[PDB]
Design an enzyme around this catalytic site. Structure first.
Site, mmCIF file in Angstrom:
data_model
loop_
_atom_site.group_PDB
_atom_site.id
_atom_site.type_symbol
_atom_site.label_atom_id
_atom_site.label_comp_id
_atom_site.label_asym_id
_atom_site.label_seq_id
_atom_site.Cartn_x
_atom_site.Cartn_y
_atom_site.Cartn_z
ATOM 1 N N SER A 48 0.513 -37.711 39.868
ATOM 2 C CA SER A 48 0.964 -38.031 41.232
ATOM 3 C C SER A 48 1.325 -39.501 41.469
ATOM 4 O O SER A 48 1.837 -39.832 42.540
ATOM 5 C CB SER A 48 -0.075 -37.608 42.268
ATOM 6 O OG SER A 48 0.024 -36.210 42.514
ATOM 7 N N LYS A 51 4.831 -40.068 42.677
ATOM 8 C CA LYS A 51 5.228 -39.881 44.085
ATOM 9 C C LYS A 51 5.722 -41.184 44.718
ATOM 10 O O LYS A 51 6.552 -41.153 45.624
ATOM 11 C CB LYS A 51 4.079 -39.309 44.925
ATOM 12 C CG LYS A 51 3.812 -37.826 44.705
ATOM 13 C CD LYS A 51 2.455 -37.436 45.295
ATOM 14 C CE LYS A 51 2.248 -35.924 45.326
ATOM 15 N NZ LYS A 51 2.159 -35.333 43.976
#
Length: 267
Positions: A48, A51
């Site tokens: 992540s 992101k």
């Protein structure tokens, strides 16, 4: 270039061994421009932490169309994937790209990430944005949740600690984005809710910190941070960690310890 001192190398090497994994660390002192690291040119699965690059690509687009970030985006049950803490509340309703960006950065909402990827033209366009800010290591190949498989030797969905540190500097502190956009990104990072046990836990509690965590298979445990030390120019810190077995448990304290090691050599 690598400004890492002998003692710091010893400490990070020892940490990596104690934790039974592969650790990648880069730290930029933005005051001097010095960068220092451990395995900072090896590929690591981003999970992540990718992101940030995706939201930044979207923010760059908003520079030429400011109302982009306030336009309603319908969210459907079909958009939901494995972890949708914010977006699951808006099924049959709409969220703005501002809301989607806050959700994916501050809560690591995976449906929000996929909605942002859709708007941008997919992982390949997030990769093209990375190239546009001078990052030649970043590659986003897949969307959520398959980008987290984190298999040793697999180059998909990887970057290096050096490249991600340099990119985070350009995006959150430098001039890769317009002023309004940079400040948006920096405030979203400062409001992260998933980082208390990672880099933040190893830094002085009085310091302002923005970060984005990552987590994936092979016990992959990541964090990338911008740090505003008291009365000192900011630091950028990347701590990537991944482990030998697919089912390994996360080790957030390794990142806290790596941050503490870094912090001690710069404060």
């Amino acid at each position: 270039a690598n400004h890492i001192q002998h003692q710091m190398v010893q400490q990070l090497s020892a940490l990596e061994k104690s934790a039974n994994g592969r650790l990648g660390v880069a730290v930029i002192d933005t005051g001097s421009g010095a960068i220092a690291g451990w395995r900072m040119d090896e590929p690591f699965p981003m999970c992540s932490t990718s992101k940030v690059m995706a939201v930044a690509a979207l923010l760059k687009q908003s520079e030429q169309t400011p109302e982009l970030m306030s336009q309603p985006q319908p969210v459907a049950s079909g958009d939901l994937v494995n972890y949708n803490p914010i977006t699951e509340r808006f099924v049959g309703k709409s969220m703005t790209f501002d809301e989607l960006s806050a959700a994916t950065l501050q809560y690591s909402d995976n449906a929000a990430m996929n909605l942002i990827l859709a708007k941008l033209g997919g992982p390949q366009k997030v990769t093209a944005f990375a190239r546009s800010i001078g990052d030649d290591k970043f590659r986003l190949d897949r969307n959520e949740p398959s980008l987290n498989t984190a298999i040793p030797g697999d180059l998909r969905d990887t970057s290096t600690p050096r490249a991600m540190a340099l990119s985070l500097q350009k995006l959150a502190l430098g001039d890769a984005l317009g002023q309004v956009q940079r400040e948006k990104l920096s405030h979203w990072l400062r409001g992260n809710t998933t980082g208390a046990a990672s880099i933040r836990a190893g830094l002085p509690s009085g310091w302002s910190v923005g970060d984005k965590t990552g987590s994936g298979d092979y016990g992959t445990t990541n964090d990338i941070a911008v740090v505003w030390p008291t009365g000192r120019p900011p630091l950028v810190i990347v701590t990537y960690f991944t482990q030998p077995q697919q089912q390994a448990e996360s080790q957030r304290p390794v990142l806290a310890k790596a941050a503490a090691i870094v912090a001690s050599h710069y404060v």
